């Protein structure tokens, strides 16, 4: 007698003879495992590693005849160490690279039994999941990272997965804060995947991430534009100043070269030209041609009335051709990527 | 008497029939768990990861009537492996990124049983906890970093957290010597937080950090100021020295960018403009204008009043640029100091 003893003998009756080796209703119809997620945060998104780190509260909800009990109206909340004594789904993340269940104080697990035998099983998880990124639009791109949930051991003949509440099964997307990215939306999918060993159930959670251009405007585009404008100071300096005109020009070209090579050190060595690379090569041509501008005028001024006329005409043209053409190139660049 | 045989058999009866699966007073009112923390150190605070590392002695006090014993005056202290044989609440830290309990020699845990059944459970923990930071005032900012404490499984119907001793429940914050920050204030909060599965008890410990500007004055502002001053040396050099005033101009412009490239490494890739970034672009404007000044002077001179105009602009730039940068420098600091 006494409710403490009554519960103790009730739980023992549930577990005495309970075979953890057999799934619920083994041999019979497949057991449906409903699950839902509360996202804690996305720690980081890495292009160099082509992955992102996701922290979440992952929960599973299934029915087991063997755990039904009567005489107790309460939903028994047992110590998390009971997880070692119960059958639980072999769910796993297919695209996961590295993950762990948080273990501070005591391993972060929850089990909540109910009279009819339905079990709620919860975990707090951090997973570094692979996410391949189409960097051709970088940094004006948007990406589709996903988490791929699947059962390892049991095929569709034994396990069925479903989102509890449909589209309402995932929460916490509102509290994901990232410097570079803002979540345009998230999407939930359910599928059956077929391997050589059979057809397995799948649930997929997808995030569409759109990048923030603020950082790259200040750090990359503004320098390149300012250095390119700096190249036009050459056209206004007198043509007799060979030392100054050349020194201004070559140093500008040198600066553009270092900017071009530097940025690729912070991101994966992907073998194709990105949107920003096209811009930096576009800027390079202008600063490079702005140096040849002085190369020819020097040749015409000294080595070839052509000494007085053509030398002045070419320099005067450059003061309007270069600024105009750079704006023409700049206008086409943003209309191509931002407006289309 | 307190013979070890008597103590052994006493401890055996307490554990005989004990069930770790059930909380104290199961089915009855909630278990009152009293938290208590002694801060050992805050190892580091990093903006690039939006997190800080904290090491602490973490203790929990609760009463379990199943462990009450009589005939022993002592508060029994036992080998820490008794922890695996007893019920201990499932406290955890919400915003931690990765954490571990120290394991040198033997896992740093403590259990001390009192005659009335009160259990003292303590363990030394090092936690790396997330702290989102507002960098809109980077060298001149203030930050709130918190440690959130919660029970994973048991709702408020089963467990009630509280700070044992009230505002005295956290100690050692008096003694945290952070190099880049200073603990202006800390405060303790308790509340109930509701999810779909129920209302859970929560305690949270908050620190308010104010930064030390010393490092950034030495490494970013003074270099920016001195290079900006150096750019004004062009105005004193004669206009005829084209190669000199251009070299003095181009070099300063590319030194300002060299400062930005270093700042590109110390912080996360944030979209918005920070206070330091605003100052660097402020300096870049003066350094950039310091070279446009010569370009127009060279154009005016070589393109006899023209000789006078070139000299006059040097006289104007010799006064306007130092005066305007001082005015800009004055307005900048007053904004971030008064606000």
């Amino acid at each position, epitope marked *: 007698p006494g409710n403490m003893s009554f519960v103790k003998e009730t739980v023992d009756k549930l577990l005495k003879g309970y075979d953890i080796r057999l799934r619920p209703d083994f041999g019979g119809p497949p057991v449906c495992v409903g699950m839902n997620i509360d996202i804690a945060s996305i720690d980081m998104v890495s292009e160099v590693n082509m992955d992102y780190t996701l922290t979440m509260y992952f929960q599973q909800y299934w029915r087991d005849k063997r755990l039904a009990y009567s005489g107790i109206p309460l939903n028994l909340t047992l110590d998390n160490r009971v997880a070692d004594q119960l059958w639980v789904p072999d769910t796993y993340f297919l695209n996961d690279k590295k993950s762990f269940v948080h273990g501070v104080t005591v391993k972060n697990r929850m089990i909540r039994l109910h009279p009819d035998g339905t079990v709620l099983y919860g975990l707090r998880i951090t997973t570094t999941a692979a996410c391949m990124m189409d960097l051709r639009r970088y940094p004006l791109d948007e990406q589709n990272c996903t988490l791929e949930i699947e059962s390892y051991g049991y095929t569709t003949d034994d396990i069925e997965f479903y989102w509890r509440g449909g589209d309402k099964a995932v*929460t916490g*997307v*509102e509290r*994901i804060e990232l410097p570079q990215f803002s*979540i345009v939306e998230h999407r939930l999918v359910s599928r059956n995947v077929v391997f050589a060993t059979g057809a397995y159930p799948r649930l997929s959670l997808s995030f569409r991430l759109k990048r923030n251009i603020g950082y790259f405007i200040l750090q990359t585009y503004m320098p390149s534009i300012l250095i390119t404008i700096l190249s036009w100071v050459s056209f206004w300096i007198n043509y007799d100043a060979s030392a100054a005109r050349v020194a201004l020009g070559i140093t500008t070209v040198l600066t553009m070269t270092t900017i071009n090579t530097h940025l690729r050190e912070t991101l994966p060595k992907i073998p194709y030209v990105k949107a920003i690379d096209m811009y930096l090569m576009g800027c390079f041509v202008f600063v490079f041609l702005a140096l040849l501008e002085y190369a020819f005028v020097n040749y015409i001024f000294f080595s070839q009335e052509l000494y007085k006329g053509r030398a002045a005409a070419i320099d005067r043209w450059s003061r309007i051709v270069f600024p105009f053409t750079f704006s023409l190139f700049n206008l086409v660049y943003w209309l191509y990527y931002v407006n289309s | 008497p307190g013979n070890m045989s008597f103590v052994k058999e006493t401890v055996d009866k307490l554990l005989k029939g004990y069930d770790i699966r059930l909380r104290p007073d199961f089915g009855g009112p909630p278990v009152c768990v009293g938290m208590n923390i002694d801060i050992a150190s805050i190892d580091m605070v990093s903006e690039v990861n939006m997190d800080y590392t904290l090491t602490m002695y973490f203790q929990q006090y609760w009463r379990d009537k199943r462990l009450a014993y009589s005939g022993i005056p002592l508060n029994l202290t036992l080998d820490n492996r008794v922890a695996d044989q007893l019920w201990v609440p499932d406290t955890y830290f919400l*915003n931690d990124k990765k954490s571990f309990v120290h394991g040198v020699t033997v896992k740093n845990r403590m259990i001390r049983l009192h005659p009335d059944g009160t259990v003292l459970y303590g363990l030394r923990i090092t936690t790396t906890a997330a702290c989102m930071m507002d960098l809109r005032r980077y060298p001149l900012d203030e930050q*709130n970093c*918190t440690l959130e404490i919660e029970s994973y499984g048991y709702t408020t119907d089963d467990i009630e957290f509280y700070w044992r001793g009230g505002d005295k429940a956290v100690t050692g914050v008096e003694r945290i010597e952070l190099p880049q920050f200073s603990i202006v204030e800390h405060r303790l909060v308790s509340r109930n937080v509701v*999810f779909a599965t129920g*209302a859970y008890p929560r305690l949270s410990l908050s620190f308010r950090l104010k930064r030390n500007i010393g490092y950034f004055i030495l490494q970013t502002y003074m270099p920016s100021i001195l290079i900006t001053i150096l750019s004004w040396v062009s105005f004193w050099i004669n206009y005829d020295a084209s190669a000199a005033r251009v070299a003095l101009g181009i070099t300063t412009v590319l030194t300002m960018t060299t400062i930005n490239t270093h700042l590109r490494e110390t912080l996360p890739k944030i979209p918005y403009v920070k206070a330091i970034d605003m100052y660097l672009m402020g300096c870049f404007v003066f350094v950039f204008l310091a070279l446009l000044e010569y370009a127009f002077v060279n154009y005016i001179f070589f393109s006899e009043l023209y000789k006078g105009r070139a000299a006059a602009i040097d006289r104007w730039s010799r006064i306007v640029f130092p005066f305007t940068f001082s005015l800009f420098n004055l307005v900048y600091w007053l904004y971030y100091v008064n606000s």
Partner: nanobody, 108 residues
């Protein structure tokens, strides 16, 4: 008909990234309506206002807006505006919101 509500904030709004709209009538529990995130733009709603209302924000003016479009008679209530901490619990529960507005009445 249609209507629009505005909610302005000041102070340490960085510590309270999410703003929520709640509504109540005498003799009834306080209901959830929707929420918006500073700097994130993501929004969520109650099913009773899906596709009828829309919450938007101006991050520079520090104001949250609820485009109360496509009214119905059952929308009579005082629409409190509230803020939520970063690490508080679920959105749909008023107990998680610390700072609350004056609750402007609307009648339909």
């Amino acid at each position: 008909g249609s209507l629009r509500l505005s909610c302005a904030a000041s102070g340490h709004t960085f510590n309270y990234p999410i703003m929520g709209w709640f509504r109540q009538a005498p003799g009834k529990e306080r209901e959830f309506v929707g929420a918006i995130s500073w700097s994130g733009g993501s929004t969520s709603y109650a099913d009773s206002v899906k596709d009828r209302f829309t919450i938007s924000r101006d991050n520079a003016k520090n104001t949250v807006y609820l485009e109360m479009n496509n009214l119905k008679p059952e929308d009579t209530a005082v629409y409190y505006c509230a803020a939520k901490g970063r690490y508080s619990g679920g959105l749909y529960y008023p107990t998680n919101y610390d700072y609350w507005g004056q609750g402007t009445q609307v009648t339909v």
